[PDB]
Curated annotation (Swiss-Prot), chain B:
Keyword vocabulary terms for this entry: ATP-binding, Kinase, Nucleotide-binding, Nucleus, Phosphoprotein, Transferase
The organism of origin for this protein: Homo sapiens (Human)
InterPro entries, per database record: DCK/DGK (IPR002624), Deoxyribonucleoside_kinase (IPR050566), DNK_dom (IPR031314), P-loop_NTPase (IPR027417)
Positions bearing Phosphothreonine: 42
Function: Phosphorylates the deoxyribonucleosides deoxycytidine, deoxyguanosine and deoxyadenosine. Has broad substrate specificity, and does not display selectivity based on the chirality of the substrate. It is also an essential enzyme for the phosphorylation of numerous nucleoside analogs widely employed as antiviral and chemotherapeutic agents.
The protein's name: Deoxycytidine kinase
Superkingdom to which the source organism belongs: Eukaryota
Length: 229, 230
């Protein structure tokens, strides 16, 4: 009965801005933020190092990082289903990215750029599949909100944000991520190994224009979209 | 109602052999062979054969990745056995070849203590281990442990006897440290363990220094007296 909605989008496309604006509109709406975003406690401690290790040599840490990101995400998402929104009439939990983006956007891309060998990729996939076929329908998504944007907007938004460890992220990586987003979410040409994702509605929203003070139209779409599910 | 007994000991102490003796002795007794031994067809084998070989070559690079996939395959494979067979047995016993506690408190810990995992790999693995057993590995809880005790010397010979090409390069020095962590876990019961029920589980210790392959009957009697105390 709690609807599960994932917000997807390239680095710095404004997802955390969005979902924070959303948290403020409905007492009936909650947010699960991305743990890597949190890294960017023991987990908080482990995530810091592994994120810094990922930046300084990705071919060494990609497997470790991708398995830890996902597990940290799976336990924050499970926790909020048990923890937040308890007696709500129309419960919606918004996820800052998903187990699917973890694997079919980010981990797939890292494989393609040779930062994980085959053994690494099918170990990761094997692990991601056994486990993501253990929770019946409990994390499965009611729909997806694709925050569509350009890499230069995104590149611009990294400078403005001002995480110094990110101030090296080049355009072309951001450019790689986008095609993968656009390929999966927009032209819808990327079959997963998950059954229901074929019949999973998708709202795309243009976030190239700035929205911290002009979001009503975007939000109107989210409520419009939410009433079809 | 299945009873779950962990068979524990060093590399080439005789676990695989005793486990194949036991299984034939009753229709109520079955075994879950340890993934890592089959890795030395299925995609798990391919990954397994691959990462094990990488681990031989470069353990400082591969131990986390190895440890993670060996534990996962174990939990997986133990589940398949526990929710598969022994529906009909009146006195069902499942003998596991090693445990998730072996994986962690012998092998992972030794890799961490030998600097083949780093503080973050090992802390991430421990966090991963805490959680993976508790989301999925809960009915794998153990009733007993059987330690097959064999000197580091015994194994190297037996390693030579079993004759795998990869194993022959393993040094007495390695058998020594893994030899030393077994004792503290299961004899002294030195080992602090996150799983508090684990400090209370009955252990049985069996010296397996002589060829017991022809002549296993007294070992089998000690197992049998243990199983009815459980
Ligand atoms: C700070 C965001 C986390 C990072 S860091 C990182 C990365 C850092 C340095 C990199 O290169 C070093 C010089 O080539 C890098 O390049 C990978 C080669 O294609 C990726 N990619 C990422 C995106 S991978 C990722 N996986 C997830 N599962 C979630 C998520 N948010 N990000
Ligand atoms: C069948 C043995 C599998 C291997 S291979 C291996 C190993 C091989 C070569 C090694 O070094 C030679 C190159 O420097 C090596 O050194 C480890 C350094 O701490 C370990 N350790 C092991 C034991 S780790 C282990 N973890 C498990 N979880 C299960 C299991 N059966 N074994
Ligand atoms: O309409 C917007 C959306 C985002 N940003 C900025 O873009 C940066 C990245 O946004 P966010 O942290 O939400 O990115 P994401 O969560 O998608 O990585 C932040 O500094 C935002 O303040 C902005 O100035 N106007
Ligand atoms: O009493 C024994 C115990 C073991 N072995 C041999 O020693 C090797 C190692 O035994 P096993 O594979 O059972 O050891 P594990 O690695 O399973 O502990 C094998 O070739 C066995 O046939 C033996 O000849 N007599």
């Amino acid at each position: 009965r709690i609807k599960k909605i994932s917000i997807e989008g390239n680095i710095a496309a404004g997802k955390s801005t969005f979902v924070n604006i959303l948290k403020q509109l409905s007492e009936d709406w909650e947010v699960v933020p991305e743990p890597v975003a949190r890294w960017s406690t023991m987990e908080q401690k482990n995530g810091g190092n592994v994120l810094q290790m990922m930046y300084e040599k990705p071919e060494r840490w990609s497997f470790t990082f991708q398995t830890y990101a996902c597990l940290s995400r799976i336990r924050a998402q499970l926790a909020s289903l048990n923890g937040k929104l308890k007696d709500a009439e129309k419960p919606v939990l918004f996820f800052e990215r998903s187990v699917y983006s973890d694997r079919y956007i980010f981990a797939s891309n890292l494989y393609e750029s040779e930062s994980m060998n085959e053994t690494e990729w099918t170990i990761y996939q094997d692990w991601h599949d056994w486990m993501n076929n253990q929770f019946g329908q409990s994390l499965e998504l009611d729909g997806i909100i694709y925050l569509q944007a350009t890499p230069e907007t995104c590149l611009h938004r990294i400078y403005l944000r001002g995480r110094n460890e990110e101030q090296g992220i080049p355009l072309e990586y951001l450019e790689k991520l986008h095609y993968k987003h656009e390929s999966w979410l927009l032209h819808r040409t990327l079959k997963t190994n998950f059954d229901y994702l074929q019949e999973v509605p998708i709202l795309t929203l243009d976030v190239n224009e700035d929205f911290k003070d002009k979001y009503e139209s975007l939000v109107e779409k989210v409520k419009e979209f939410l009433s079809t599910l």
